[PDB]
Amino acid sequence: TQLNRALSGIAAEQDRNTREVFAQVKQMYKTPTLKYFGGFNFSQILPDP
Amino acid sequence: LKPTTFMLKYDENGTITDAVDCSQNPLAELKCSVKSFEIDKGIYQTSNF
Numbered sequence: 001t002q003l004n005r006a007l008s009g010i011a012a013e014q015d016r017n018t019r020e021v022f023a024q025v026k027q028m029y030k031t032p033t034l035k036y037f038g039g040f041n042f043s044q045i046l047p048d049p
Numbered sequence: 050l051k052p053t054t055f056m057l058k059y060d061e062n063g064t065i066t067d068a069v070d071c072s073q074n075p076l077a078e079l080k081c082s083v084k085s086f087e088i089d090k091g092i093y094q095t096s097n098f
């Protein structure tokens with residue numbers, strides 16, 4: 001059981017790292033339909049619907 | 050009588066106040082797991098099958 005905590009202590013704290021990096025946004029924003037802003041082309045960075 | 054597992058609670062005077070069958074139902078192993086009658090909200094790893 002001591003070996004189970006030691007992995008489960010890792011496996012949760014490994015899951016904690018992923019939330020802190022990415023989910024720094026409160027709000028989901030829809031991708032704009034204009035993938036071209038003022039001459040700048042964002043096609044390979046935004047996902048394609 | 051059966052040879053199974055009990056958790057016992059003693060007072061400050063050495064008197065049994067309470068007990069819980071550790072083989073009764075899946076909640077009651079958890080109280081035997083963490084050594085507490087009162088248990089917080091969360092997910093808790095208990096024994097293998």
Ligand SMILES: *[C@@H]1O[C@H](CO)[C@@H](O[C@@H]2O[C@H](CO)[C@@H](O[C@@H]3O[C@H](CO)[C@@H](O)[C@H](O[C@H]4O[C@H](CO)[C@@H](O)[C@H](O)[C@@H]4O)[C@@H]3O)[C@H](O)[C@H]2NC(C)=O)[C@H](O)[C@H]1NC(C)=O
Binds near residue numbers: 035036041042043048
């Ligand atoms: C920003 O840059 C990106 C590059 O990453 C660019 O995305 C791609 O551009 C090409 C060319 O404009 C698009 O390809 C077209 O897609 C249609 C879909 O049916 C094809 O049929 C077209 O092919 C015809 O035309 C070609 C030359 O004109 C011929 O070689 C071909 O045989 C056909 O005759 C055409 O190639 C491609 O679809 C996009 N990519 C995506 C995911 O849309 C993007 O266009 C740039 N931004 C802007 C605003 O232009």
Ligand SMILES: *[C@@H]1O[C@H](CO)[C@@H](O[C@@H]2O[C@H](CO)[C@@H](O)[C@H](O)[C@H]2NC(C)=O)[C@H](O)[C@H]1NC(C)=O
Binds near residue numbers: 060061062
């Ligand atoms: C544990 O034993 C003690 C005695 O050592 C009990 O304490 C007494 O309790 C009575 C009635 O409750 C009081 O009038 C006394 O003042 C207490 N004495 C002391 C020294 O505390 C105590 O009640 C027992 N525990 C339980 C849960 O009953």
